[PDB]
A paper describes a structure:
Photosystem II (PSII) of cryptophyte algae associates with alloxanthin chlorophyll a/c-binding proteins (ACPs) to act as the peripheral light-harvesting system, whose supramolecular organization is unknown. The PSII supercomplex consists of a homodimeric reaction center core and peripheral antenna protein subunits, where the peripheral antennas absorb light energy and transfer them to the PSII core to initiate charge separation in the primary electron donor P680, a special pair of chlorophylls (Chls). In this work, we isolate the PSII-ACPII supercomplex from a cryptophyte alga C. placoidea and solve its structure using single-particle cryo-electron microscopy (cryo-EM).
Three-dimensional cryo-EM density map of a PSII-ACPII dimer is obtained at an overall resolution of 2.47 Å. The PSII core is composed of four large transmembrane subunits (D1, D2, CP47, and CP43), thirteen small, transmembrane subunits (PsbE, PsbF, PsbH, PsbI, PsbJ, PsbK, PsbL, PsbM, PsbT, PsbW, PsbX, PsbY, and PsbZ), and three lumenal extrinsic subunits (PsbO, PsbU, PsbV) involved in stabilization of the oxygen-evolving complex. Among them, ACPII-1/2/3 are associated at the PsbX-PsbH-CP47 side, and ACPII-4/5/6 are associated at the PsbW-CP43-PsbZ side, respectively. Unk3 associates with CP43 on the stromal side of the PSII-ACPII supercomplex and interacts with the nearby ACPII-5 subunit, facilitating connections of the ACPII antenna subunit with the PSII core. In the EET from ACPII subunits to the PSII core, five potential EET pathways are identified. At the stromal side, EET mainly takes place through three pathways; one is mediated by ACPII-2, CCPII-S and CP47 subunits, the other one involves ACPII-6, Unk3 and CP43, and the third one involves ACPII-3 and CP43. Thus, the CCPII-S and Unk3 subunits previously unidentified in the PSII-ACPII supercomplex may have crucial roles in mediating EET from the outer antennas to the inner PSII core in the cryptophyte algae.
Residue numbers in the entry:
A (entry chain 2): 44 to 216
B (entry chain 5): 32 to 73
C (entry chain w): 69 to 113
D (entry chain 3): 45 to 222
E (entry chain S): 115 to 171
F (entry chain 4): 53 to 224
G (entry chain c): 206 to 257
H (entry chain i): 1 to 35
């Protein structure tokens, strides 16, 4: 049984296909050694951080709060290192992921699904077919935004201009 | 207005438990229930 | 200068440490019988 | 068997739901390694101290006793403005209260050996909570107020330490940090 | 003499029983029969010197 | 029946004035019904009197009150009258009445027999008979809700424009 | 120690007389206290109850 | 010099407290003729 | 079974210690060790004193 995505590679033995986005893509085979649930937790959390970061880059480029100074998103990082807002942000992220550690321990013990914090306040996903479709869409968007946030940061690093600014005048060098 | 037994002075409050009416000046006016906590004689 | 105390921060340990030792001693004493006896000393512990 | 407060976590084994204020919120599992009576006693004592502390934070700035050294609306500086001898008299009086109300049982290994509910210091001069359901409702209200007052006392104390301004005065004269 | 011990002096509250946080009994005081205080302190210390973090990987 | 998609809470099962099954958030699940209905009638009556008084204040004032309070209405009127002591007197006497209201609520919740909002204040025996009493209950509740929304409208209109009720609706 | 002297350094008769008033009050109050009380449990555990 | 003073005060108070509450802990019973 | 303070008192007043500590030893051991330490170091290397 070869992989659905990679036709010349065998399907990994731990990737049965029940997970969302499980197309069989694992050339290096990290799922053969490390736990698949923990890997999906890390993937989903990386993707959620990246999606929020991409939306934040777009919004920060298009609109900054009037009581904050106007500047690019990437070099604001040192400004909030000095000012103290970034310390607050990482403080609250650490506070949430202190309980995230307990959730990860319960994931290790097998009493929790991977990436399932049961956070559905608006009740968007309740039907099982819609829930599976939303899982697939969420993982695809997570991967796309994980690529996109690094794209944005590196393009700003090489071109010294933001995203929509670069889409304005496409300077090639 | 609604049916039910209430105090003679205040018509929306019931007659207090320890204000039976034997003592003079008793129109059944004890909203906070001081007679329920302490003795009526004192 | 009472008890040689010139800074009010010195009073914190002088009062605090006996409180903790008294808490331990009070656990010990609450474990006891604590009724009167007629003898030179109490043999119950 | 998920907890109500943490839907993604399992319910703690010692938090069945019989104790008041229980929504299964013990993520770190303190109830698995500590006496829940001791934990509830500590929670209630902290909460009552903080309720009276928030009341004092709100009252001292608007009204103070007409005594020398007693004119300081900033309570953190009022701790150092009031003479320390009276503060230690307060400390020893509250210590005597602690001795009397616990029957001399102060350690975790002796406080509940005689038989006593956590937080039950025999204080209900209005003879309330004779009704069991009213007792449960009052316990939930007391616990919610205890937690809210702990958080509020922490916040007001930190704001007074940083901005050097008393409460509500800080609300009317809101100066954002530099 | 009074005591407020008559069978009408009861507490009142707007909260129904179905609201979360209400216990089953008034004053439960559970029997512990668990790990000692020293073991609890060792558990709080193990929060620091062996958190369940790198056991995931 | 208010919202066809959803369902009323089990506390909303008729036998109450104004029960059209409208409670989507579920306040009656965690709050007692008597307290909720007492609060609804209290807010409704307060807003009824407030809206009528605001209309009267923007129409015609008392003799000699403009000499002291000046041309101040609504919020400026409140800010001057707290210093004058009118609002202090209102607070003292209305809290004094609310003491008896509080023990009425307590006796209702412990089972004296009174209904929410029933203070026994019926001079002239108006609307004390037959179905007229129930019709007056429904009218009082609906007009209290309407006056609540109208009072909010008046307060926010003075917040936005700085004008009273009868002059904002004529000087758009 | 030197320069302080504990209670040896009483240098005026006002302090002497006032503290003797204090000693008399304290002694009388404690005397009535001991006439009307019996030693507490900590004192009963602490001391040896014999003439010697 | 104040830090050393408070350390010394803490140490002296700690040891004197141990002494005081140890001799209060039914010291007369701690003899081989008890019971 | 006993309280922590009771076990501490049993260890302090223990006859099984190689050197008996006791409650008087609680005051004695640190005082004598402090005096011994200061005496040794001040006897070895201490600057002259204006007696
Ligand atoms: C429980 C927390 C707490 C703490 C640590 C303090 C501590 C203090 N209070 Mg305070 N107070 C408290 C609660 C507290 N209070 C409450 C609940 C009230 C409302 C009744 C007040 C009302 C109050 C006033 C009006 C004044 C103080 C003042 C003071 C300071 C001098 C001591 C004194 O005379 O207190 C007196 C405290 C009371 C009579 C309240 C006791 C009531 C219960 C038992 C607590 C001292 C720092 C004085 C001050 O501001 O100094 C600058 C002062 O004038 N307190
Ligand atoms: C001065 C003497 C004194 C004494 C002997 C006690 C004794 C006690 N206090 Mg305590 N307390 C006192 C003064 C005192 N209190 C004062 C003045 C305050 C206010 C600052 C407090 C605030 C306080 C809190 C907030 C707590 C205690 C707790 C305790 C208990 C455990 C303490 C422990 O093991 O450490 C014990 C009954 C703890 C307790 O009962 O936990 C179960 C607890 O949580 N106390
Ligand atoms: C329930 C809300 C409410 C509130 C907060 C106020 C508050 C106020 N009213 Mg008002 N009023 C009310 C209802 C209310 N009234 C009602 C229902 C009426 C119609 C009878 C009026 C008619 C009224 C007039 C004609 C005047 C005020 C004025 C005032 C202000 C001066 C105080 C005074 O003399 O009141 C008087 C209030 C009453 C006599 C109403 C009491 C009778 C009903 C049954 C209660 C004060 C801010 C004065 C003002 O605006 O100063 C510039 C003024 O001239 N009021
Ligand atoms: C309850 C409603 C009410 C009523 C009926 C009156 C009636 C009166 N007020 Mg008046 N007043 C009221 C509320 C009321 N006031 C309130 C709420 C205030 C506070 C702002 C005042 C402040 C006030 C002043 C300052 C004066 C009056 C005066 C007067 C008298 C004017 C004589 C006249 O034109 O005939 C009249 C008797 C005048 C007068 O002669 O009275 C001494 C006057 O100078 N009033
Ligand atoms: C028009 C509004 C309105 C209506 C229909 C009712 C209706 C009712 N009220 Mg009510 N109430 C209202 C406003 C209203 N209230 C306001 C604003 C207050 C605050 C003062 C109260 C305070 C109140 C109390 C304290 C009590 C009632 C009670 C009652 C019930 C029996 C009395 C009755 O039939 O009165 C009929 C009333 C009217 C027909 C209102 C006449 C409107 C006048 C003419 C307005 C005056 C002109 C003005 C300037 C505009 C009945 C369901 C009693 C109850 O619960 O028993 C069941 C009771 O104890 N009410
Ligand atoms: C000659 C003086 C004298 C003597 C020998 C005693 C002896 C005693 N007193 Mg005492 N006392 C005295 C004067 C004296 N008192 C005076 C003048 C006062 C008033 C300040 C007191 C107030 C006092 C209190 C408040 C208590 C004692 C207690 C005690 C007993 C234990 C004392 C301890 O361990 O320390 C012991 C029998 C304790 C005791 O056992 O109470 C009966 C105790 O709690 N004493
Ligand atoms: C009672 C005795 C039985 C007690 C049981 C406990 C045994 C305790 C063992 C004693 C160790 C305590 C040592 C502290 C003594 C000391 O020098 O404190 C030193 C402190 C003074 O401390 C110095 O004070 C100076 C004053 O300007 C400065 O402030 C210095 O900085 C400060 O160090 O003295 C006191 O605290 C004295 C307290 C009152 C004692 C008076 C009674 C002593 C006379 C009777 C005793 C002889 C008989
Ligand atoms: C807290 C409110 C609560 O939920 O508990 C319900 C009771 C009130 O019910 C009591 O009930 C009394 C009626 S009876 O006891 O049920 O007969 C009544 O007088 C009144 O509502 C109240 O006093 O708690 C109180 O508020 C106590 C009354 C306050 C004044 C006490 C009088 C003596 C002062 C000392
Ligand atoms: C038990 C008992 C009885 C009793 C009793 C008694 C004495 C009951 C007393 C109860 C009390 C005093 C409760 C007080 C609670 C205070 C709280 C929750 C404060 C929260 C602060 C907050 C939210 C805040 C804040 C803020 C922060 C942090 C930042 C600021 O910038 C803003 C702000 C200010 C908003 C009686 C006598 C009846 C008898 C009965 O038989 C037995
Ligand atoms: C350090 C630093 C910062 C920083 C920072 C940060 C956050 C830097 C983050 C950098 C990131 C996230 C880079 C990500 C790169 C992702 C790549 C190249 C994926 C390629 C995927 C491919 C090619 C897929 C290929 C494919 C595969 C395999 C599957 C399908 C086929 C195909 C599509 C071809 C700041 C900004 C905070 C400032 C601070 O002062 C300094
Ligand atoms: C101010 C001044 C100027 C000149 C004249 C004047 C009289 C006025 C003078 C003094 C006035 C006044 C108020 C003097 C007061 C003196 C006082 C309070 C003396 C009290 C001393 C207390 C002493 C020893 C305590 C001894 C007890 C001890 C160790 C412990 C006993 C026990 C316990 C409790 C712990 C364990 C060990 C043991 C033995 C079981």
């Amino acid at each position: 049984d070869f992989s659905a995505a990679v036709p010349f590679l065998k399907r990994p033995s731990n990737l049965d296909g029940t997970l969302a986005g499980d197309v069989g893509f694992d050339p290096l085979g990290f799922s053969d050694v490390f736990d698949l649930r923990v890997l999906r937790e890390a993937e989903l959390k990386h993707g959620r951080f990246a999606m929020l970061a991409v939306l934040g880059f777009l919004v920060q480029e298009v609109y900054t709060f009037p009581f904050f100074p106007k500047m690019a998103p990437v070099d604001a990082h040192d400004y909030f290192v000095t000012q103290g807002g970034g310390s607050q942000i990482i403080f609250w992220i650490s506070f949430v992921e202190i309980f995230g550690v307990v959730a990860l321990f319960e994931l290790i013990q097998g009493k929790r699904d991977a990436g399932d914090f049961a956070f559905d306040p608006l009740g968007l996903g309740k039907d099982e077919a819609t829930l599976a479709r939303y899982k697939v869409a969420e993982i695809k968007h997570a991967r796309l935004a994980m690529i996109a946030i690094g794209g944005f940061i590196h393009q700003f690093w090489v071109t010294k201009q933001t995203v929509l600014e670069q889409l304005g005048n496409f300077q090639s060098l | 207005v609604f049916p039910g037994q209430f105090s003679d002075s205040v018509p929306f409050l019931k007659q207090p438990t320890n204000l039976d009416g034997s003592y003079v000046g008793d129109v059944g006016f004890d909203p906070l229930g001081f007679s329920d906590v302490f003795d009526i004689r004192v | 200068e009472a008890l040689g105390i010139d800074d009010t921060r010195l009073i914190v340990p002088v009062i605090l440490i006996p409180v903790i030792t008294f808490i331990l001693y009070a656990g010990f004493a609450s474990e006891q019988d604590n009724e009167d006896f007629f003898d030179t000393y109490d043999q119950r512990r | 068997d998920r907890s109500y407060a943490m839907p993604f976590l399992s319910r703690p084994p010692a938090l069945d739901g019989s104790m008041a204020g229980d929504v299964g919120f013990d993520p770190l599992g303190f109830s698995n390694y500590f006496d829940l009576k001791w934990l509830r006693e500590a929670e209630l004592k902290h909460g009552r101290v903080c309720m009276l502390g928030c009341l004092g934070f709100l009252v001292q700035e608007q009204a103070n006793l007409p005594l020398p050294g007693f004119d300081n609306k900033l309570a953190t500086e009022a701790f150092f403005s009031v003479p320390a001898g009276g503060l230690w008299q307060i400390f020893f009086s509250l210590g005597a209260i602690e001795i009397i109300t616990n029957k001399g049982k102060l350690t975790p290994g002796s406080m509940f050996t005689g038989g006593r509910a956590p937080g039950d210091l025999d204080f209900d001069p209005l003879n309330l909570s004779v009704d069991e359901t009213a007792l449960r409702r009052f316990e939930l209200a007391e616990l919610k107020h205890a937690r809210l007052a702990m958080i509020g006392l922490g916040g007001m104390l930190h704001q007074m330490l940083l901005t050097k301004q008393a409460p509500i005065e800080q609300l009317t004269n809101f100066k954002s940090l530099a | 003499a009074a005591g407020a011990d008559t069978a009408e002096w009861v507490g009142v509250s707007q909260v129904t029983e179905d609201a979360p946080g209400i216990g089953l009994y008034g004053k439960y005081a559970p029997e512990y029969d668990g790990p000692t205080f020293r073991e609890g302190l060792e558990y709080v210390l193990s929060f620091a010197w062996k958190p369940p973090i790198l056991i995931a990987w | 029946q208010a919202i066809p998609g959803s369902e009323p809470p089990p506390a909303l099962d008729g036998t109450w004035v104004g029960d059209v099954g409208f409670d989507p958030l579920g306040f009656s699940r965690v709050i007692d019904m008597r307290w909720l209905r007492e609060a609804e009638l209290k807010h409704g009556r307060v807003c009824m009197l407030a809206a009528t008084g605001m209309i009267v204040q923007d129409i015609a004032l008392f003799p000699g009150v403009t000499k002291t309070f000046g041309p101040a209405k609504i919020t400026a009127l409140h800010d001057v009258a707290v210093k004058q002591g009118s609002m202090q007197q209102l607070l003292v006497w209305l809290g004094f009445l609310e003491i008896f209201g509080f023990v009425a609520i307590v006796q209702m919740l412990q089972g004296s027999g009174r209904q929410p909002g029933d203070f026994g204040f019926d001079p002239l025996n108006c609307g004390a008979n037959t179905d007229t009493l129930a019709r007056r209950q429904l009218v009082e509740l609906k007009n209290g809700r309407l006056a609540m929304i109208a009072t909010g409208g008046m307060i926010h209109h003075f917040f936005l424009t700085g004008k009273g009720p009868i002059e904002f609706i004529t000087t758009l | 120690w030197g320069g302080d002297g504990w209670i040896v350094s009483v240098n005026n008769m006002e302090d002497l007389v006032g503290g003797h008033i204090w000693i008399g009050i304290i002694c009388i109050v404690g005397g009535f206290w001991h006439i009307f009380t019996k030693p507490f449990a900590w004192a009963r555990r602490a001391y040896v109850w014999s003439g010697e | 010099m104040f830090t050393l003073k408070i350390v010394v005060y803490t140490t002296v108070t700690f040891f004197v407290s141990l002494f005081t509450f140890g001799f209060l802990s039914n010291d007369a019973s701690r003899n081989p003729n008890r019971k | 079974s006993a309280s922590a303070w009771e076990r501490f008192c049993s260890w302090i007043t223990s006859t099984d210690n190689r050197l008996y500590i006791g409650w008087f030893g609680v005051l004695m051991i640190p005082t004598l060790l402090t005096a011994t330490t200061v005496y040794i170091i001040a006897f070895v290397a201490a600057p002259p004193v204006d007696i």
